[model samples]
Target: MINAHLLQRMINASNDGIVVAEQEGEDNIVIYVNPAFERLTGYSADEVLYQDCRFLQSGDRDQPGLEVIRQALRQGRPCREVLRNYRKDGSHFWNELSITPVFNDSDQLTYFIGVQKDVSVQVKAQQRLLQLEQQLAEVQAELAALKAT
Candidate 1:
């Protein structure tokens, strides 16, 4: 109902962090990121531009979702994953991330749209559910053991 804006400006105004990465020969180089990305990661666009996203992980290679991400990137396929990512402040955050490969009419993969959101609270809730399930399983085991006594 209000004044409309250009697509670029709308993207810039989005709450989710967004990035556009060029598919370079062996590396995906980020060309641009929205202001939300700066807020989410505490990284200025200066240091983030022209760099691979692996810096977000920063040596924490324990996540298996990275393997799926690599496979998707190799195939130029769209991918989505809930991943563990680190911020510029060295704290970890749960990131719900998705990447879509963009192509021109020539059918060549040119760029990628990477969208990210902080879902740490959701992840923590799911983890709590898993913990409760495990506790229930243990209690059931104890009950069965007592019955056998």
Candidate 2:
């Protein structure tokens, strides 16, 4: 069995938040969550272990994002995406999530590694810039219309 101290050291060495989930009867249940996970989501391992990941899901996740993740996992590909998720306090945050399926010697699925990095600030800034660009376009259109009139 892996020692607790070594496991903790491995987790801490990782820059991104890491969660381990095993394939259960129907859904993946969390088995381990690192300290970085708590720092990112404000939820401790005790709060999430043995639980489904739906708690982190927010209404903002789109079908494209979901499909991209599902397709990658089904094909045994490492998937990366920006997802909007909620924290323990119900505050919304953007996560740059990278999910990889771990396999055994026979290539059988063993577990999944869910790596999460907080990218809320960068994503929000990009969204704000997009909104500003759209507003500028609208204003320019109105100005053109006035000139035509």
Candidate 3:
């Protein structure tokens, strides 16, 4: 098992936003977050500890992406999802986040790990490609109908 000191050092060294939460009743309460997280989200760890992650929600949030994450956590499985989140300064950002459930010796979930990285640029690029693909498919369907007629 990784020691707490080593874990903390790793968190400090990591460039991506890192957060850990203890499995509690109803909602998982954040226990630790790294400095990069503060820099990325503009909120200190103190402000988030013992609090839910609603602070990261933007007004126009993706429910389906959040539901995927919820399903993974419920099954104690590792998962990655892209979603829109808000910074403490109220700036919008895209987070490509991965969640890993850490288990104790008894195979019980002890803590949950959340690693977040900004992927706004990449996501936007992919969205553009998808739109182009949809346009192409529409043109192909039109051609097929004309050929049949």
TM-score of each: 0.85, 0.77, 0.78
lDDT of 3 by residue, 1-149 (tens): 77999977877998888988887875779998889999999997788899878568858656688889888878889999887898877888899889898988987746889999999888889999999999999999999999999
Report model 1's TM-score to 2 decimal places. Answer: 0.85
The parts of candidate 1 lying over 4 Å away from their true place are 1-5, 140-149
Q: Each candidate's lDDT (Cα)? A: 0.89, 0.83, 0.86
Candidate that beats the other on lDDT, 2 or 3, i.e. the better one: 3
Which candidate has the highest lDDT of all?
Answer: 1
lDDT for each residue of candidate 1 in 1-149, tens digit (9 for 90 to 100): 54556776888888989999997867789999899999998999999999888889877886888889889999889999888788888989989889999999988856899999899988899999999999999999999999999
> Model 2 misses residue 22 by how many Å?
0.8
Candidate 2 stretches greater than 4 Å from native: 1-10, 58-64, 139-149
Clashes of each: 0, 0, 0
Q: 2 or 3: which has the higher TM-score?
A: 3
Q: Which structure is stronger by lDDT: 1 or 2?
A: 1
Residue-level lDDT of model 2, residues 1-149, one tens digit each, is 89999977887988789888887855669998888888888898788989877678856656477789878866767889887899888999888988888999987766888989888888889999999999999999999999999
